[PDB]
Symmetry: D2
Subunit: 266 residues, 4 copies
């Protein structure tokens, strides 16, 4: 007879796990994650900020890249998140143990983070990671300032209820660069209509397309770089093909409309 | 070049995942887990108690067996744990969502349960499961009474800091049966001496052998049935070869002493 | 010289603390709180629901009234909240310890409840109460069904970020009665404009007036009965003067507009 | 008729709330609390440690004294606790919000801290304070090192289940000074014998007298300075009359034995 199935690990494309050296985006902002998962380090005269960490097994690589940038574990002050799925918040618990970093997130992201991504609205317990506690709860439009760099939260619920875009202004060539780190606008395998766990899912996505379209946005970055047409392995041309926030939102909405139509037809 | 390794799932022997029908231990007490993982259902005129749940994927099987016993989800009042590792507390979060059950545990087990077994003193993040919150914190020697059956906590730290034996008195053939559900006394791959995460590990194990030896114990049961020589697949003879609590403690101590000697020699 | 001030207790009008016997609202719905704080008991063939509990010292009185209604501690299945301030969620922790009740709330209310109302956006640590954990997180528009009575969540952020209206359909004289338990729409001493802890406060209140105006609403009830012109001490005429949801929302908006004007002038 | 009683604030002797300037204990160790509540600042070349904070309203005074010592909010790295009652852990939540500090505590202290001192084994909800989360859980005998100063945990359960002595070695006049910060050994109004919430209370106190007696202890400090005969207002003679750890333990045991006898006679 037949035993219950073994637990299945959350496995991902190899490029999501391929370490890369730090790639500079602007004067204080660096990509320090893997080829296909974004983890942004922002360095200030008063400590560093990390936006996303990628997968759980990326913690040591992140710490190595911070060190290469001159950031010791004590210097990391703040972790911000796009959303609290395993492939973006994965190493947060371990980073908190090994650095001085505290986590700021909205309430939805905080409760999902605290249960390690378990009981996901769409994925059940299939994508769990080590749970972590948020140290600060942020509201929509709230700002957090570190070493004089101001980060603004823009809620864009849909991909998760707590999905957030973070914006800040850096510099390049003596000119301001308004960076928008916009969260995922995908709905991979989601039941969109009449979802009892997320009854206003479609309304939230539509509002979120509008939110992303209107962001202050000289340079768009996304948790999965391919979503904004970044190629982190392409060196000096890594961001050459990057979408505007308007184009990113429009593409996501067109895809979403197609998915809605297929769902009705399914 | 080389990507970071994929996450590895916690996989176990097939017999640990082999469903079995309920096996009666005494008038109110049943084994309802798998062939090689204990999950005890105690049925009272005022609701049911579950002691351990086994692996995370066992939740639905547990609920099926409760139903077979006449226990609806609303009837399950209380979950108790031997210790909060993935193969004994695995389905606790899901059971809480799907039943009326509340969890009672000591502080050490509660904090480990709340982080889903992550940052384990010995296993790091290798054995995580969905986190759950305890509803009641118990102290050593504290009693919990359900439908007139009295459960007593006996702390036996070592295998985990929060390892607990639970004892209660059931009946069989009109005579009282003092049941001892004693936790694991193993230290699988543990650094025993000079462990910076558990400096008093050896003292705690020695105290725990003494605690187990002295338990009220007409019938011994253990989270892994093989540890007390139970054979759940052997029907009417399932408990025939079961160890006494004294014999279980003595065997565990002799094994532990051997492991200490090998560690010194390693 | 001068010692730091003593801690100050959260004290309230005596009528907020004046016990009353259960007052029937509809066939399954009763007011069981105090003269001036609402606590609604909904009794079903499969257990009871409590909506709000009032102040922390009201726990035993609530349990007394449940008993008078035939509801034992084991029979209380679910606690819902308007918002997680001390005068409405006060006894929740104790009720959870003393009954079978589990708490369902949105993420904002859950995180405020979990810190016992401390670090309030407007009141700091002035109104703390015993913290409690939510057992279930609900989304806007989500339904919860108990004994066949269906409760629908309607988020109406403003008074707190997690402020919620709950609606359900009961019966009276063989006819359906659509009950709306709408949260507070007050902003007592709040900084409304340019509040760094709540930057979209005004937008949220405006949306919430519209939400309340549109609720299914044969009978309106509010956490403070005076807000909807209920008089719990007036017996058979207790609800005679009750506002419609439309009138409640309109009055709240007119008051809010006046407060905005005074703030600008202050 | 009669309303339920108003909530009662936890009020204390004025001297417990009387601010004092920093008082040096050894080369890196300062008393920065109030005249009658200990809060120890330990300053290292790599950040500062705070042991206890006193009452909730003491947060700003603590931050003022740290500033006077040259410790900015970012420089405070670690908070340790004797035990998690309101008059020693009171300001911890606020300190975490306003500084870079993370909390390390044992599991018992962590769960009590997380519920803001509510549901106390002896005092119920009479002494609540803002809840805080621990960032690191420590085991008995575990060390924590900051800027080269090594702090060792010594569990001494009784006054609370999580009561802890902290020891470290500082210097004075070129010679090592072994400082013991030993927790309270009082049992104020406690039911000692047959306490269903703390069945092994007497055994734990007896073990704790023995633990305190044996501590490395050139200088004893206690959360209430009077308990070790410190007089913080007495300047150069503040510690002149301080008890040894042996004398402190002996006095506490003699008092405890008297209380046991009175309880039997009561
Ligand atoms: O990649 C995907 O299709 C889905 C399957 S499980 C995981 C959660 S949402 C997305 C990662 S952002 N991902
Ligand atoms: O079975 C074992 O050797 C170890 C490896 S990881 C997991 C945690 S302790 C034991 C299950 S009780 N087990
Ligand atoms: O009644 C009030 O004015 C304020 C002062 S503090 C407390 C929190 S909001 C309202 C109770 S709903 N209340
Ligand atoms: O001071 C006291 O008698 C008691 C009454 S309530 C509070 C908790 S234990 C002690 C403060 S350490 N104290
Ligand atoms: Zn995702
Ligand atoms: Zn992703
Ligand atoms: Zn184990
Ligand atoms: Zn096991
Ligand atoms: Zn309120
Ligand atoms: Zn109120
Ligand atoms: Zn105390
Ligand atoms: Zn004290």
């Amino acid at each position: 007879e037949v035993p219950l199935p073994q637990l299945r690990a959350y496995t991902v494309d190899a490029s999501w796990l391929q370490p890369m050296a730090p790639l500079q985006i602007a004067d204080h902002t660096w990509q320090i994650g893997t080829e296909d998962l974004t983890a942004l380090l922002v360095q200030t005269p008063d400590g560093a900020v990390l936006l996303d960490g990628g997968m759980p097994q990326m913690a040591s690589h992140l710490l190595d890249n911070m060190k290469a940038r001159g950031v010791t574990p004590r210097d990391l002050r703040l972790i911000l998140l796009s959303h609290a799925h395993a492939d973006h918040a994965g190493p947060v618990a371990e980073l908190k143990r090994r650095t001085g970093a505290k986590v700021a997130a909205n309430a939805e992201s905080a409760v999902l983070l605290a249960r390690g991504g378990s009981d996901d609205l769409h994925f059940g317990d299939g994508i769990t990671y080590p749970p972590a506690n948020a140290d600060r709860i942020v509201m929509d439009g709230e700002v957090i300032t570190v070493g004089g760099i101001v980060f603004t939260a823009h809620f864009m619920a849909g991909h998760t209820p707590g999905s957030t875009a973070w914006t800040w202004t850096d510099t390049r060539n003596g000119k301001p660069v308004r960076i928008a780190y916009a969260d995922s606008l995908s709905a991979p395998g989601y039941q969109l209509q009449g979802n009892p766990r997320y009854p206003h899912l479609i309304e939230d996505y539509r509002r979120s397309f509008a939110t992303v379209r209107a962001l202050p946005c000289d340079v768009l970055l996304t948790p999965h770089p391919g979503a904004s047409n970044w190629d982190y392995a392409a060196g000096a041309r890594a961001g050459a093909k990057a979408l505007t926030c308007k184009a990113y939102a429009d593409a996501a909405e067109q895809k979403f409309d197609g998915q809605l139509a297929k769902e009705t037809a399914g």
